[PDB]
Every structure is written in C-alpha cells, then in structure tokens.
Design a protein around this ligand. Structure first.
Ligand SMILES: Cc1ccc([N+](=O)[O-])cc1S(=O)(=O)N(C)/N=C/c1cnc2ccc(Br)cn12
Ligand SMILES: [Cl-]
Length: 340
C-alpha cells in the first residue's frame, strides 16, 4: 500500500532522503526494464519509476548521464534508490502521453496531426538534443516512443537514456544501435566512428513520419532498411558512402523528389527541413540548434501564436548560455524581440 525508501536526489550532493510513495501499478514492462507509476506521499505528485537490473561491478551509465541533465524538454530524475540480485530504481517526473500514441490516434482515425503540433513537438525535440549534444551525450534511440507529451500544455520531454553514450573521437562504437526505422544510414553501413548527427537523422525520420502519417523508412529487415532509404534519397554516391563509413570500400536508383514524397498540402518549409536533416553525409545535416532556428518553426516565434485549446505555448525561447554555446549568434533568430 505505502512504500518508503531512502532515495538519493539526482541533483545536489549525495544526501539521501526518506521518500514515501503509493498507488503503485505497472505501466510498462519492456527491454527498457520495468516501469511503474506512483504518487509521492508528501506532494501527491505523480512519478514514473524505472527499474533495471544493476550489478555493482560497474556504475550505471544511464544514472551517471541522468544526474548531469537539467532541462525542461528532458524528463527529470527526481530521486534514485536500490532494491531487492539488485535493481536500480530511477524516480522520474511522470508524463501522460507519447508521440507514438498520439501519432497513432490520428493515423487510425485517418486524420493528419496538425502542423502546429508537428512544430511544437519537433522544436522541443531539437532543443533537447542541442542541450545533451553540448555535453557530447548522444541519445542513440530517438524514436516516437521516447518522446513524452502532456497534451494539455503541448510540452515534450525526451526520455530513456539507457542507450545514451558520451561519444569521443578515437573511441569506436557499435553500429547496430537505434530502432530500425530511425537508424542513420552510416550505422547501417557499419560506421563505428559516428557522431551525434545520428540523433538528427532520427529526428528527421520522426518529423517526416508526423507529416506522412506513417514511418518514411519502414524497413522489413536490417538490410531492407537501406533499400527503403534508397527509394527516397537515391543511391548514395561513392563520395557520400565514404563520409558515412570510410572503411566501406567498393547498383543505381534515382532520387525521388522531396515534394512528391509528402501530401500536396505539406508546407514547403517542412519539406526543406526534412531535406536538411535526412542527408546521407552526416556532417551536412543540420545541427539541433540550426534546426530549431529553421524557418519551419517561425510560427512558434510569432507573438500571437497559441495552442488550439486556447492556452499559451510552452517555454520555447528561455535559452541558457549553455544551450547557445555551440552557435551563440543564433540567439538573434532563436529568441524573438517579444521574449527578451
Ligand atoms: C513509453 C516508454 C518509453 C521509455 C521507457 N523507458 O525508457 O523505461 C518506458 C516506457 S513505458 O514503460 O512503456 N511507459 C508507458 N512509460 C510511461 C512513462 C510515463 N512517464 C514516464 C517518464 C519516464 C519514463 Br522512462 C517512462 N514514463
Ligand atoms: Cl549522509
């Protein structure tokens, strides 16, 4: 009925606090681990609790990554504790929806997700990426299930840092790492020297999916995932293949134009954004901050903009100087006059 634990706060120094929660039910049981929902006894606040098997031989990478992060578009680690063969327990802010589930309502209702929500959710995603990439943390599992929503406030929160890694040049990494559909072509090509731009490819695949109503590259297998990319982008050149994976040394299909991929209705600026994210050569793709400053998101910088339910937009321009470090002159576009 009532559970009490001695939990350590994610921020601050290691000063554990007795925490009591109740109304414990299982809301998720997957490869991510087991996830519960619960109500904190002092504030009545809803928390999600993520529980994974953790042997003491190594420090948990996800916990080490979570404790650094403090950002409004990322789910906050409130506390952590140990239980039970030993499990790590992350107590996290509860978020009631996901982009996966929302996109699916619209799709099964044969309805388009309104472009205003496409903008809000994707801007907030890119912002969360700029923040973590500024620390060299690549998420490596950007997909609709990991994008949590409050549908009343339109706030998006990136979650699950269980695949996340601080990438450092020279130290190679594994090529098979995202959800197939959202996997960057360099990864398919077996690059071990990849950058944070793999998250930007994944972001693009989410963007396109929200415009199309269905995944743009629904690969039948690990190998068919590339055949599906070839259909749209065309066959990558020798020059492009070298940039994705230099070791891959050595079939034509022509590029299908970007306008004709989407419905006639689709805003050109949305299309232009897809083309600057879903490039073959990783270094050509936009950075998360450049993406946030793309003209597709100009409506979010309009002073008059509101949500369809009547409320104001969430906090979109309260940038810290840490967030702006990668390209500070983008502040003159990212923070409009009315916000300064
Ligand atoms: C949807 C989802 C995405 C990621 C994880 N994960 O990394 O353990 C779990 C789940 S889930 O247990 O299937 N579930 C529906 N999650 C609900 C939930 C609600 N609020 C939060 C907040 C953080 C995490 Br993690 C999960 N949630
Ligand atoms: Cl102490």
């Amino acid at each position: 009925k009532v559970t009490t634990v001695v939990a350590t706060p994610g921020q601050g120094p290691d000063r554990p606090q007795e925490v009591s929660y109740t109304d414990t039910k299982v809301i998720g049981n997957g490869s991510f681990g087991v996830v519960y929902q619960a109500k904190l006894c002092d504030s009545g606040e809803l928390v999600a609790i993520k529980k994974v098997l953790q042997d003491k031989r190594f420090k948990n990478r996800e916990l080490q990554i979570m404790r650094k992060l403090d950002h409004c578009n990322i789910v906050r680690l409130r506390y952590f504790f140990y239980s039970s063969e030993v499990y790590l327990n992350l107590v996290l802010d509860y978020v009631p929806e996901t982009v996966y589930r929302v996109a699916r309502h619209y799709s099964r209702a044969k309805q388009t997700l309104p472009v205003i929500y496409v903008k809000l959710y994707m801007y907030q995603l890119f912002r969360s990426l700029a923040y973590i990439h500024s620390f060299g943390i690549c998420h490596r599992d950007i997909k609709p299930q990991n994008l949590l929503l409050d549908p009343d406030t339109a706030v998006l929160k990136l979650c699950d840092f269980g695949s996340a890694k601080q990438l450092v040049r020279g130290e190679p990494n594994v090529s098979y790492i995202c959800s197939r559909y959202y996997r960057a072509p360099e990864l398919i090509f077996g690059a071990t020297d990849y950058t944070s731009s793999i998250d930007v490819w994944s972001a693009g695949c989410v963007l396109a999916e929200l415009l199309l109503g269905q995944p743009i590259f629904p690969g039948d297998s690990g190998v068919d995932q590339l055949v599906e990319i070839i259909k749209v982008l065309g066959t990558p050149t020798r020059e492009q293949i070298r940039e994705m994976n230099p070791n891959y040394t050595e079939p034509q299909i022509k590029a299908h134009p970007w306008t004709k991929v989407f419905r006639p209705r689709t805003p050109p600026e949305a299309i232009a954004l897809c083309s600057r994210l879903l490039e073959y050569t990783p270094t050509a793709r936009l950075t998360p901050l450049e993406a946030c400053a793309h003209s597709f998101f100009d409506e979010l910088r309009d002073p008059n903009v509101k949500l369809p339910n009547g409320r104001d937009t969430p906090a979109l321009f309260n940038f810290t100087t840490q967030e702006l470090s990668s390209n500070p002159p983008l502040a003159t576009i990212l923070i409009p006059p009315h916000a300064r």
